[PDB]
Amino acid sequence: SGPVPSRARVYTDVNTHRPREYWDYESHVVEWGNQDDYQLVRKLSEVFEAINITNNEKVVVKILKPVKKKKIKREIKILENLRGGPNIITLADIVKDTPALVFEHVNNTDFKQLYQTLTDYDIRFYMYEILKALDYCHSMGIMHRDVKPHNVMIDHEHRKLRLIDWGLAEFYHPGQEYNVRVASRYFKGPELLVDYQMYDYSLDMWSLGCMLASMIFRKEPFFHGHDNYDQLVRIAKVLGTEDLYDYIDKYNIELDPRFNDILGRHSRKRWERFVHSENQHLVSPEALDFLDKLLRYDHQSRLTAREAMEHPYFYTVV
Ligand SMILES: O=c1cc(-c2ccc(O)cc2)oc2cc(O)cc(O)c12
């Protein structure tokens, strides 16, 4: 038989109706800069602290390992297209002499020490700033596909945020089937876990939901499995089994020989039950209702990044 196809609810054709020079990265002319403009100072995966000689400016250089030329091109073209977007890491330069990407400098506040200083107001503020980056990149036809805390740099001392590591990002094309290896296991949407390849921007919205959940409930990560099979089980224990099968049925997905039994039966849990005495100060009914609308099995019924910015949760921050 086979599975039912899917198209993105919003921003379906932004790449389709744009010139080939925008999305067609494999045949892109990369204008290489000079590595001798920059002086490597310290290693921060080959990421280096550096100084631009031509102006004494602090930068961060990423030296690219032996990967396929088309993967280097994909990341370069995406960063170039998104340069100037709110809270997207700025590509200052691309250099040779062996390829390197040069980024604006950013401090990273030590997590844990970030995780202990953060108030309810800080989370709303930083979630809003990530959402401006996601709405912007989605509107530009780009999925990030790796939204997670290690790719969200928060410079708390300066109240600053950058969405980084666009190495796994892709341009959205309706009907296209994509790799399901992408993203950290813990932030993989149900679509990636059931091997449904025709996904879209909505994946990043699931990942963002897992981010909020673990931040407000203070448990990293929120859904914790050892494989893709167990991961779906951990999500099922919270969202319930009924809404999951309603999703399988809707898209005619056929489960792996292992999914059937490990699922069992689970009711939908109210989010309030996860509030305990150490995380109480970060949670509100607004926060819980926003989380509920992001973390839905159905990728077509998840809040878009724009819809999300209109939730009462962010009212105090807008
Ligand atoms: O660890 C870092 C990684 C990156 C980075 C940024 C963009 C990419 O596509 C890949 C990696 O930028 C940074 C920028 C900084 O200012 C500081 C960092 O530690 C990093």
UniProtKB/Swiss-Prot annotation:
Q: Where does ATP bind?
A: K62
Q: Where is the Protein kinase domain?
A: 38-314
Please give the chief subcellular localization of this protein.
nucleus
Q: What class of enzyme is it?
A: transferase
Q: What is the lineage of its organism?
A: Eukaryota, Metazoa, Chordata, Craniata, Vertebrata
Active-site residues, record numbering mapped to chain: D146 (proton acceptor)
Q: What is this protein called?
A: Casein kinase II subunit alpha
What does it do? Answer: Catalytic subunit of a constitutively active serine/threonine-protein kinase complex that phosphorylates a large number of substrates containing acidic residues C-terminal to the phosphorylated serine or threonine. Regulates numerous cellular processes, such as cell cycle progression, apoptosis and transcription, as well as viral infection. May act as a regulatory node which integrates and coordinates numerous signals leading to an appropriate cellular response.
Catalysed reaction per UniProt? L-seryl-[protein] + ATP = O-phospho-L-seryl-[protein] + ADP + H(+); L-threonyl-[protein] + ATP = O-phospho-L-threonyl-[protein] + ADP + H(+)
Task: Give compartment(s).
Answer: Nucleus
Other observations noted:
Can use both ATP and GTP as phosphoryl donors. Phosphorylation by casein kinase 2 has been estimated to represent up to one quarter of the eukaryotic phosphoproteome. Casein kinase 2 has been found to be increased at protein level and up-regulated at the level of enzyme activity in the majority of cancers. However, elevated levels of casein kinase 2 are present in certain normal organs such as brain and testes.
Oligomer status and interactors: Heterotetramer composed of two catalytic subunits (alpha chain and/or alpha' chain) and two regulatory subunits (beta chains). The tetramer can exist as a combination of 2 alpha/2 beta, 2 alpha'/2 beta or 1 alpha/1 alpha'/2 beta subunits. Also part of a CK2-SPT16-SSRP1 complex composed of SSRP1, SUPT16H, CSNK2A1, CSNK2A2 and CSNK2B, which forms following UV irradiation. Interacts with RNPS1. Interacts with SNAI1. Interacts with PML (isoform PML-12). Interacts with CCAR2. Interacts with HIRIP3.
Has keyword Transcription?
yes
| Native organism | Homo sapiens (Human)
Per the record, the similarity remark reads:
Belongs to the protein kinase superfamily. Ser/Thr protein kinase family. CK2 subfamily.
Q: What is its EC number?
A: 2.7.11.1
Instruction: Write the span of the intact protein that is present.
Output: 2 to 328 of 391
Q: Where is this region: Interaction with beta subunit?
A: 35-40
Q: Does the keyword ATP-binding apply?
A: yes
The post-translation modification note in this UniProt entry reads: Phosphorylation does not directly affect casein kinase 2 activity, but may contribute to its regulation by forming binding sites for interacting proteins and/or targeting it to different compartments.
Q: Supply the alphabetized keyword list.
A: Apoptosis, ATP-binding, Biological rhythms, Cell cycle, Disease variant, Intellectual disability, Kinase, Nucleotide-binding, Nucleus, Phosphoprotein, Serine/threonine-protein kinase, Transcription, Transcription regulation, Transferase, Wnt signaling pathway
